[PDB]
Design an enzyme around this catalytic site. Structure first.
Site, PDB file in Angstrom:
ATOM      1  N   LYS A  37      44.865  37.268  30.187  1.00  0.00           N
ATOM      2  CA  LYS A  37      44.110  36.415  30.918  1.00  0.00           C
ATOM      3  C   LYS A  37      43.167  35.976  30.031  1.00  0.00           C
ATOM      4  O   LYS A  37      42.644  36.548  28.968  1.00  0.00           O
ATOM      5  CB  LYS A  37      43.338  37.381  31.872  1.00  0.00           C
ATOM      6  CG  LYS A  37      43.682  38.278  32.786  1.00  0.00           C
ATOM      7  CD  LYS A  37      43.037  38.849  33.732  1.00  0.00           C
ATOM      8  CE  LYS A  37      43.349  39.410  35.319  1.00  0.00           C
ATOM      9  NZ  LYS A  37      42.353  39.977  36.025  1.00  0.00           N
ATOM     10  N   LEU A  84      53.212  42.292  32.261  1.00  0.00           N
ATOM     11  CA  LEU A  84      53.717  41.040  32.640  1.00  0.00           C
ATOM     12  C   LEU A  84      54.752  41.371  33.878  1.00  0.00           C
ATOM     13  O   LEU A  84      55.761  42.051  33.758  1.00  0.00           O
ATOM     14  CB  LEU A  84      54.729  40.425  31.473  1.00  0.00           C
ATOM     15  CG  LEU A  84      55.323  38.855  31.877  1.00  0.00           C
ATOM     16  CD1 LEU A  84      54.226  37.980  32.191  1.00  0.00           C
ATOM     17  CD2 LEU A  84      56.115  38.270  30.753  1.00  0.00           C
ATOM     18  N   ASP A 129      36.024  41.215  44.704  1.00  0.00           N
ATOM     19  CA  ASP A 129      36.584  39.726  44.857  1.00  0.00           C
ATOM     20  C   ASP A 129      37.912  39.376  45.632  1.00  0.00           C
ATOM     21  O   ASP A 129      39.001  39.437  45.059  1.00  0.00           O
ATOM     22  CB  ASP A 129      36.750  39.220  43.442  1.00  0.00           C
ATOM     23  CG  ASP A 129      36.897  37.677  43.283  1.00  0.00           C
ATOM     24  OD1 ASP A 129      36.884  37.148  42.362  1.00  0.00           O
ATOM     25  OD2 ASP A 129      36.873  37.135  44.410  1.00  0.00           O
ATOM     26  N   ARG A 133      42.893  38.533  45.660  1.00  0.00           N
ATOM     27  CA  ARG A 133      43.698  39.500  45.824  1.00  0.00           C
ATOM     28  C   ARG A 133      45.066  39.132  45.723  1.00  0.00           C
ATOM     29  O   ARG A 133      45.210  38.130  46.433  1.00  0.00           O
ATOM     30  CB  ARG A 133      43.724  40.450  47.191  1.00  0.00           C
ATOM     31  CG  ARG A 133      42.424  41.108  46.896  1.00  0.00           C
ATOM     32  CD  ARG A 133      41.774  42.055  48.176  1.00  0.00           C
ATOM     33  NE  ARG A 133      40.937  42.849  48.088  1.00  0.00           N
ATOM     34  CZ  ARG A 133      40.357  43.635  48.833  1.00  0.00           C
ATOM     35  NH1 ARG A 133      40.674  43.724  50.294  1.00  0.00           N
ATOM     36  NH2 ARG A 133      39.361  44.476  48.812  1.00  0.00           N
ATOM     37  N   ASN A 134      46.061  39.598  45.021  1.00  0.00           N
ATOM     38  CA  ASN A 134      47.585  39.071  44.879  1.00  0.00           C
ATOM     39  C   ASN A 134      48.414  40.285  44.571  1.00  0.00           C
ATOM     40  O   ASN A 134      48.054  41.246  44.307  1.00  0.00           O
ATOM     41  CB  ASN A 134      47.465  38.093  43.974  1.00  0.00           C
ATOM     42  CG  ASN A 134      48.703  37.163  44.146  1.00  0.00           C
ATOM     43  OD1 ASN A 134      49.376  36.946  45.169  1.00  0.00           O
ATOM     44  ND2 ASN A 134      48.991  36.403  43.136  1.00  0.00           N
ATOM     45  N   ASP A 147      45.142  40.544  40.717  1.00  0.00           N
ATOM     46  CA  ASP A 147      44.017  39.795  41.076  1.00  0.00           C
ATOM     47  C   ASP A 147      44.093  38.490  40.389  1.00  0.00           C
ATOM     48  O   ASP A 147      42.998  37.807  40.194  1.00  0.00           O
ATOM     49  CB  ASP A 147      42.642  40.578  40.552  1.00  0.00           C
ATOM     50  CG  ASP A 147      42.301  40.476  39.122  1.00  0.00           C
ATOM     51  OD1 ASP A 147      43.260  40.265  38.373  1.00  0.00           O
ATOM     52  OD2 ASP A 147      41.229  40.706  38.727  1.00  0.00           O
TER      53      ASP A 147
HETATM   54  C1  LIG Z   1      47.734  43.964  48.872  1.00  0.00           C
HETATM   55  N1  LIG Z   1      46.253  44.068  49.040  1.00  0.00           N
HETATM   56  C2  LIG Z   1      45.650  43.690  47.736  1.00  0.00           C
HETATM   57  C3  LIG Z   1      46.320  43.167  46.486  1.00  0.00           C
HETATM   58  C4  LIG Z   1      45.746  43.026  45.372  1.00  0.00           C
HETATM   59  C5  LIG Z   1      44.556  43.847  45.361  1.00  0.00           C
HETATM   60  N2  LIG Z   1      43.662  43.708  43.853  1.00  0.00           N
HETATM   61  C6  LIG Z   1      43.062  44.619  43.157  1.00  0.00           C
HETATM   62  C7  LIG Z   1      43.202  44.566  41.894  1.00  0.00           C
HETATM   63  C8  LIG Z   1      42.186  44.201  41.018  1.00  0.00           C
HETATM   64  C9  LIG Z   1      42.370  44.037  39.585  1.00  0.00           C
HETATM   65  C10 LIG Z   1      43.587  44.394  39.098  1.00  0.00           C
HETATM   66  C11 LIG Z   1      43.954  44.466  37.591  1.00  0.00           C
HETATM   67  C12 LIG Z   1      44.380  45.497  36.818  1.00  0.00           C
HETATM   68  C13 LIG Z   1      45.154  43.434  37.534  1.00  0.00           C
HETATM   69  C14 LIG Z   1      42.569  43.756  36.733  1.00  0.00           C
HETATM   70  C15 LIG Z   1      44.521  44.804  39.979  1.00  0.00           C
HETATM   71  C16 LIG Z   1      44.570  45.188  40.944  1.00  0.00           C
HETATM   72  C17 LIG Z   1      43.746  44.430  46.219  1.00  0.00           C
HETATM   73  C18 LIG Z   1      44.473  44.416  47.603  1.00  0.00           C
HETATM   74  C19 LIG Z   1      43.770  45.154  48.689  1.00  0.00           C
HETATM   75  C20 LIG Z   1      44.122  44.926  49.757  1.00  0.00           C
HETATM   76  C21 LIG Z   1      43.516  45.759  50.757  1.00  0.00           C
HETATM   77  N3  LIG Z   1      42.362  46.594  50.034  1.00  0.00           N
HETATM   78  N4  LIG Z   1      42.810  46.188  48.691  1.00  0.00           N
HETATM   79  C22 LIG Z   1      42.136  46.740  47.649  1.00  0.00           C
HETATM   80  S1  LIG Z   1      45.327  43.871  50.471  1.00  0.00           S
HETATM   81  O1  LIG Z   1      44.832  42.449  50.259  1.00  0.00           O
HETATM   82  O2  LIG Z   1      45.956  44.081  51.445  1.00  0.00           O
END
Ligand SMILES: CN1c2ccc(NCc3ccc(C(C)(C)C)cc3)cc2-c2c(cnn2C)S1(=O)=O
Length: 255
Positions: A37, A84, A129, A133-134, A147
């Protein structure tokens, strides 16, 4: 976990996060393919502090279905080094494999994600954020929470209490995960396609919900509908989702 920059060979742009481009690269500690990133405005410490925050907060996280943080470089240009996911974003993976992924694989992904969400909740991690979310694909049988992308508020994914009042709890995350599940079972179709964000809350408040996806087991659609209880208190917990998804996966593999 500060990495020496000469250990990183920055490769091509492969996507984007909230703060700038995501690149492929190589990390010699050898030849580990990684994602990196970058941050457009990290000359400003206000931006730099926000860019790095979760990398620090999530540093010791280790879950098979969450993108792992490898390290940071906190001298300009500031970089975050992470694993990756060579197969890209789950949405496009599902689209390009619409007629070549078995239903058992789709349910596996939902299950895997539930395990990751239960783990984060167990670390008392709150992910604020929500637009970022991904889900990424690290192999044919492994998806991971991220994310950033590979290749505004997400109203169409959000719980009624989040849209109405900006209330955000684990229950609101459960609503959103129900939507994620529906998207997976729809081979990557987005919810409420063509609908104005403004009109979403009206449909929900009229009792309307996203329809059962073609070929989705009724038991799994039932679980989605429970995630979409209007009353957040009546939604299942991530623990229950994980248990229930495991039972559903087994049943499909037995068809
Ligand atoms: C599937 N859903 C979802 C998808 C992705 C995340 N991201 C949280 C995250 C943030 C940062 C990272 C790093 C380590 C790469 C920096 C990894 C994951 C969250 C979610 C999610 C959903 C419902 N609750 N949450 C937490 S979702 O939208 O269904």
């Amino acid at each position: 976990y500060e990495i020496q920059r000469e250990r990183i060979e920055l490769g091509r742009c492969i996507g984007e996060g909230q703060f700038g481009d995501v690149h492929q690269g190589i990390y010699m500690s050898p030849a580990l393919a990684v994602a990196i990133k970058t941050c457009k405005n990290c000359t400003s410490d206000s931006v730099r502090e926000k860019f790095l925050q979760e990398a620090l907060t999530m540093r010791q996280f280790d879950h098979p279905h969450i993108v792992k943080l490898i390290g940071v470089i906190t001298e300009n240009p500031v970089w975050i080094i992470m694993e990756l996911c060579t197969l890209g974003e789950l949405r496009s993976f599902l689209q390009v494999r619409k007629y070549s992924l078995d239903l058992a694989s789709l349910i596996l992904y939902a299950y895997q994600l539930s395990t990751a969400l239960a783990y984060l909740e167990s670390k008392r991690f709150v992910h604020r954020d929500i637009a970022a979310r991904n889900v990424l694909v690290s192999s044919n049988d492994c998806v991971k929470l991220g994310d950033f992308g590979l290749s505004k508020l997400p109203i169409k994914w959000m719980a009624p209490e989040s849209i109405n009042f900006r209330r955000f709890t684990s229950a609101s995350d459960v609503w959103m995960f129900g939507v994620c599940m529906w998207e997976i079972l729809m081979h990557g179709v987005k919810p409420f396609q063509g609908v104005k964000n403004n009109d979403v809350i009206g449909r929900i408040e009229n009792g309307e919900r996203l329809p059962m996806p073609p070929n989705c087991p009724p038991t799994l659609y039932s679980l989605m509908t429970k995630c979409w209880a209007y009353d957040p208190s009546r939604r299942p917990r991530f623990t229950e989702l994980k248990a229930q998804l495991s039972t559903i996966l087994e049943e499909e593999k037995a068809q």
